[PDB]
Design a protein around this ligand. Structure first.
Ligand SMILES: CCCCCCCC/C=C\CCCCCCCC(=O)OC[C@H](COP(=O)(O)OCCN)OC(=O)CCCCCCC/C=C\CCCCCCCC
Ligand SMILES: CCCCCCCC/C=C\CCCCCCCC(=O)OC[C@H](COP(=O)(O)OCCN)OC(=O)CCCCCCC/C=C\CCCCCCCC
Ligand SMILES: CCCCCCCC/C=C\CCCCCCCC(=O)OC[C@H](COP(=O)(O)OCCN)OC(=O)CCCCCCC/C=C\CCCCCCCC
Ligand SMILES: CCCCCCCC/C=C\CCCCCCCC(=O)OC[C@H](COP(=O)(O)OCCN)OC(=O)CCCCCCC/C=C\CCCCCCCC
Ligand SMILES: CCCCCCCC/C=C\CCCCCCCC(=O)OC[C@H](COP(=O)(O)OCCN)OC(=O)CCCCCCC/C=C\CCCCCCCC
Ligand SMILES: CCCCCCCC/C=C\CCCCCCCC(=O)OC[C@H](COP(=O)(O)OCCN)OC(=O)CCCCCCC/C=C\CCCCCCCC
Ligand SMILES: CCCCCCCC/C=C\CCCCCCCC(=O)OC[C@H](COP(=O)(O)OCCN)OC(=O)CCCCCCC/C=C\CCCCCCCC
Ligand SMILES: CCCCCCCC/C=C\CCCCCCCC(=O)OC[C@H](COP(=O)(O)OCCN)OC(=O)CCCCCCC/C=C\CCCCCCCC
Ligand SMILES: CCCCCCCC/C=C\CCCCCCCC(=O)OC[C@H](COP(=O)(O)OCCN)OC(=O)CCCCCCC/C=C\CCCCCCCC
Ligand SMILES: [Cl-]
Ligand SMILES: [Cl-]
Ligand SMILES: [Cl-]
Ligand SMILES: [Cl-]
Ligand SMILES: [Cl-]
Lengths: 312, 312, 312, 312, 312
């Protein structure tokens, strides 16, 4: 119909609230997730007031096409939400209670600096646009914000679901707008990464390090290059999941360090064989004895330094 | 129109029933499946009673827009169901029979602790919301719950399809709700996993174990590392299907144990060669003779212990 | 409007017919295909009879919303068909001719016991439900069943498209139903499988068998294990297409037999080297000479036996 | 409303024309492509004639629901086209001009006998069905057939877009139909295939051929088998794109020939080693000297013969 | 209703403007992206003028079905946009302000000549078609063109979003059309490509180059061929992302050069062994000493020349 008119100049306040039902399909590469929740709205319309005694009823039920309903939209969605109306009720003083169930796909950036052990915050933005006759603002109803106990995300742990009470008011396309922020905090389940990726990689590296206790050139070459091939296959498998980022991450640094270590091991084997052929066995023995202790200690120190750099 | 009014205060009872027609597209990674079934509803509306003699008919046929129909919704669905109405009939006393055919996608968690030999239970939740004038509850009609004989799931065996008679009543968004639980029990067909994965892996391990009957260092190195590469390829192929879980599974433990065994075999080969070079052949012979018996027995004992731990 | 009334008690007969236009997207893993065809219906309604002389016309054209049309549904479809009405015409005696074009996705199980050389039968089920005032049955019009000459399936040969004349009548949800069966017979084009998979595998096996003409342990080990790795890669590539079945197939048996042969070849090489080291060259020579003839003959006999078992 | 009536018996002629705007998503495996074009129709309706002087206008604009419009359909489409009406105008003599923009997915078979250097023809079929009162035929308007200059297909070169003027008239479902044929000629861009696939394969084969200048059995075995593994990986990568066909193609023949060459090279190495061990060095030298020249010449001759067979 | 009439002959001017909200899903292989933006339109209709004093209002709000709205379409879209109307307001003099929010998928070609370090320009075309009574042209409103500060593309850096003020007027299908061009400039984030692809490839090549400091034929063969296999795997992984182009790119040239270098290294190893066997050690020593310096210098010079050719 038409937005309600003020007494003198006051803005119209709409109280909102979101109750989560389902959360699924978190795509790391596309930075998307899908949601299924309740949307609650409430405002005051004095034109709908009635006398309970004369009417003989306490609550009046309306239809969406029979009264004025504010237009609320989500900002970071791929398309408009698929919503259906559940209930509309009017109090004797004119207060309207609105409820609906929707479904939508949300876009939200992610941070991968600590990819196996990272935490993320997902954002949902609600906006309303002011009409040429009235100014509309948004508020938060704290008793209508929550989530179901059966909400589960495959691979993540859900911590909290709150909202920022203070809205943001600005001007866009020669009109005023109000924005609300709903935040969902999640943590990644990293248990499966240890025995699936972390430990076999260490085993393969330790297997490659056995060339320092041998003097056969062909066996050393075979060991080191074959372990390198296995490392390449594991790196391809891991990289199939991580997206491309404009910064450095923990896993990428570790993989690059492993490549560097393989290169240095090849150089050491080559040097030892060259010295042995040149009839200098003592120097080659000394070099291989040094390397036997040098490689693991440097690996451990570099890993400690990287862990401090990325998590400290 | 409007919900029927009670005599004094009694709640309105709606009898439900689901008859399965199709079941397909069980996605382990997404924890989803698709369904195609009949939905049956029945309640009492005294305002629709008629006299069979005066009307000359026994059953009156209505349209969905001409009478009041309760709003029933599924809880764990990605979107609202696609339904069409099949038949609406009214008995002379006012009893309404409703039938429809729908299609929907259901979300349900799965347990993978015994992944090759596991059984699952799938859940379908039906809910109804009470209106401001009447209270509505849900019931189960046992003669209208069942499934077709041609219902098939690719890779699973269907056991039963029942419903929990007792509903759950609670308060949500300042209104009362009633919930029903439909359970479908399935079992995985594990026949194909044995000759496709289990036995070739054993063959490859046995091939790698042949290095204990040889004294050539290069051949032993080649055998063990190449078998390791084959193991890595098989592990990648198997892991392409299993999702990531916050707990330990049977297959993952077995794979990790195989990696450990390969590492120990490499260490044994390296030790034997080092002892042989150092002019101590008897100690190397003794070690290799011990290992020849030690490896299979330990493998068998560890497999028995793991099987008891996960299935006992 | 309302279903036509009988004279005394006779059921209403609806003559059906399906004319195929397109067939595409046969998914072996999902056991699905898509269709695009014509649906023809015909029945008698005495309330629509007219006099050709008075009206001055021979055929009267109606609209779908102006007369009664029976509700026909497909049983094994994922969703309801997307149909549009092409023509409705009424004969002077009351016979109605109905035509429409639809599109749908069909679910039908497949048998993979002879996967490269198998034949399949696809099923389409038509059902109708009886109303509370009349009983409805289904019939087949043989002059309206057929297919286009340009219907093609990628990888299959289309043989015939017939229908079972006799319908199935039963009771479901306290009402009578009639079901018709349309069958489409197809055969797989197996030409490409021979030079793409069958012959290179034989070449690789023959290459691995060359180790029986050599006495170098390292070369034999390299040959056999590298050919095993190639076999594993080919097996992964083949298995990417075949779904998982609760029974044994031809290809799986062949692959398992090849794995067994590789294991036995490794054992033979190991035995020959062990005998040679132990200063028993005559026994090793005899064993290798025996194996040279033993392996191909056993392979051929096992292949003949398997072929007789699966196709005889 | 109703189709226009003839004077005595003449059929109704509809002039058609298609103007291409976009062409994209050519799927070789599914044999599909997507289109976005204009559809133009024109016919004569004498019931719509008006006097320009009395009306004071030259062109009258109508709505699609206010006049009769023929039903035109595409034959080889997966679903019905998504169309919207752009303009309807009527000339003073009764000639109607119709314009619309649609989008559709087309099915069309492809020929892969010369897959890297092949040319294809894509087909679009337009059909119309005759009503019980009038006969309708199709014609081609040559001034309204064309394509945009920015139409591009990823990986193909567009040559021409014409139409066959002569329609095909036949009887289907007891009615007459008229069919038109629109053809689009395309050519594949084969530039990228040379340096990406063709030349590295030749390099690998030449690398494998170096075993004829050596007398070390182990090195020869390593070279040949490792090059075979690389060939298998390249063949898998190439075959990921080509679909399965009931005939032989150029690429498949070349790959099979390369497999045959690898097998013969293995046999030659094995024979040379066996002769050398048997204290017959001259015969092995002669054989290897012959093979050094024999292999490339036979390869070149076989390639020339295959090229003549497939392209001559 | 009907387009507004001119005074004598002037064309109707429509001022446009696009405000970006979201940009996502840039597919390199399909050459597509998705957008979510505001569309603003403005024109003059003298038939809607009113007197503010008599009406008592300053702005009049209409509905889309109550007034005439020009038909604006996007040219390079896969389907018609999904739009909803936000606001329609009319000034006292007759100026109409129109606003809507849409979503669409755009087709735009890309250039890959400098694929890791390339910049692209994306194009959005707006068109309008003239009616038979009035001529319509398009203009740009510079105060309504812009983008949000939170617009992000995964893997790209957004630089600017402007529009070409001058429209293109031409004739199509016997009517006049006007076209506008909106351009979006983006730059690829190339940081991740260095440590993920560029440096490990250099490490592998350097590892393969170690064969010039050895005289063991078998070890050299193993090193070079295994590094070649690793190169093939890396090349497959890189090529999985780049589409096929009718021209040469930087990455393809580099990969082809690496293949050439591997071939020449194999030839050098083979020559050295052949000379050594023929009792000419000095010539082989000289050749290997030359190659030790020759290979890296030629590699560096070729890389410099290629970089100058593609970027200079
Ligand atoms: C030696 C290898 C040691 C591995 C464990 C090191 C870290 C231990 C402490 C980890 C910790 O405090 O956090 C537990 C944390 C859980 O993270 P979320 O996924 O959020 O939890 C859900 C499942 N509980 O991780 C763990 O449970 C770590 C234990 C992993 C054990 C798996 C390996 C089993 C075999 C070990 C063989 C070693 C040789
Ligand atoms: C030696 C290897 C022995 C393999 C079999 C060990 C277990 C035998 C008992 C299994 C049992 O009782 O359950 C049968 C169970 C069926 O499970 P579902 O998929 O639910 O059934 C559908 C198909 N029948 O599994 C089996 O059929 C097991 C038989 C597998 C045989 C396949 C291997 C054939 C070649 C063997 C060569 C051995 C060397
Ligand atoms: C720390 C993380 C892992 C570090 C890298 C590990 C690489 C693999 C180590 C291989 C050790 C091989 C040892 C070997 O060959 O020596 C055998 C050596 C020789 O003794 P003597 O005859 O007195 O010789 C000394 C006088 N000349 O005797 C032995 O067998 C020692 C015991 C070796 C077995 C234990 C190896 C443990 C490996 C580390 C596991 C880490 C988890
Ligand atoms: C030696 C290898 C022999 C291979 C052929 C063995 C079987 C021959 C008889 C097969 C038969 O009768 O059926 C023909 C049947 C066709 O099946 P569909 O796909 O339904 O037919 C569509 C295409 N015609 O298969 C064939 O055409 C078999 C011929 C395959 C030849 C391909 C190999 C070419 C190179 C051979 C080199 C041998 C060394
Ligand atoms: C249990 C599961 C499998 C366990 C691991 C199996 C690894 C492979 C075993 C390889 C056995 C090799 C045997 C070998 O080389 O010895 C040959 C040996 C030497 O005899 P003598 O000349 O008297 O020497 C003894 C006095 N010095 O003689 C033989 O050929 C024995 C028979 C060996 C063939 C049978 C092998 C069976 C392998 C196990 C299969 C399990 C399924
Ligand atoms: C030695 C290797 C020679 C390769 C070239 C042989 C054929 C040359 C003649 C080809 C011809 O006439 O047709 C050109 C035809 C173009 O086909 P379309 O994709 O339709 O065209 C779009 C792009 N122009 O192909 C070519 O351009 C061939 C040139 C390929 C060169 C790429 C290789 C570069 C490095 C060569 C190193 C050689 C060692
Ligand atoms: C049947 C299907 C294939 C079966 C398995 C094939 C495995 C590969 C076979 C390799 C054969 C190698 C033959 C060899 O080395 O012997 C050379 C042998 C030695 O002769 P003499 O000096 O007189 O020695 C005998 C007195 N001591 O002479 C030859 O060159 C014989 C000809 C060998 C070439 C032909 C090989 C054919 C291979 C089978 C192809 C099947 C398709
Ligand atoms: C030795 C290897 C040197 C690598 C760096 C060479 C180029 C340095 C200068 C590059 C430059 O000026 O541009 C910076 C440019 C950024 O491009 P965008 O993605 O648009 O920026 C977003 C993130 N900043 O690239 C860089 O940041 C280059 C730095 C890469 C370092 C990564 C390698 C870390 C380990 C190095 C070990 C070397 C051994
Ligand atoms: C045609 C397409 C390619 C064909 C297959 C190529 C396989 C690779 C060829 C390898 C050649 C190796 C040559 C070799 O080892 O000989 C060295 C030979 C020995 O000379 P003398 O000491 O006088 O010995 C002769 C008297 N006993 O001297 C040389 O170095 C000759 C030059 C060899 C380098 C050039 C090789 C070119 C390779 C072909 C490239 C095709 C593109
Ligand atoms: Cl929205
Ligand atoms: Cl629902
Ligand atoms: Cl249906
Ligand atoms: Cl169509
Ligand atoms: Cl559009």
């Amino acid at each position: 119909v038409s937005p309600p008119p003020p007494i003198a100049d006051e803005p119209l306040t709409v109280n909102t609230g979101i109750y989560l039902i389902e959360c699924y399909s978190l795509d790391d590469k596309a930075e998307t997730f899908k949601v299924n929740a309740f949307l609650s709205l409430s405002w005051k319309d004095r034109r709908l007031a009635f006398d309970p005694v004369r009417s003989g009823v306490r609550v009046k039920t309306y239809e969406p096409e029979a009264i004025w309903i504010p237009e609320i939209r989500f900002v970071n969605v791929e398309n408009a939400r698929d919503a259906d109306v559940v209930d509309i009720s009017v109090s004797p003083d004119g207060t309207v209670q609105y409820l609906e169930r929707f479904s939508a796909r949300v876009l939200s950036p992610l941070d991968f600096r600590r990819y196996p052990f990272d935490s993320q915050t997902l954002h949902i933005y609600l906006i309303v646009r002011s009409v040429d006759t009235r100014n509309i603002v948004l508020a938060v109803d704290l008793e209508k914000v929550g989530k179901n106990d059966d909400v589960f995300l495959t691979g993540w742990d859900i911590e909290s679901f709150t909202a920022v009470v203070k809205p943001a008011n600005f001007a866009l396309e020669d009109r005023l707008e109000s924005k609300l922020d709903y935040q969902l905090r999640i943590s990644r389940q990293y248990f499966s990464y240890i025995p699936n990726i972390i430990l076999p990689m260490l085993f393969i590296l330790f297997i490659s390090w056995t060339a320092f206790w041998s003097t056969s050139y062909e066996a050393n070459v075979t060991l080191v290059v074959s372990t390198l091939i296995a490392h390449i296959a594991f790196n391809i498998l891991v990289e199939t999941n991580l997206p491309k980022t404009p910064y450095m991450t923990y896993t990428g640094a570790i993989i690059f360090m492993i490549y560097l270590f393989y290169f240095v091991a090849v150089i050491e084997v080559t040097v030892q064989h060259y010295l042995k052929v040149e009839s200098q066995p003592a120097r080659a023995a000394s070099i291989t004895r040094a390397s036997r202790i040098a490689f693991p200690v440097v690996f451990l120190l570099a890993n400690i330094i990287l862990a401090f750099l990325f998590f400290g």
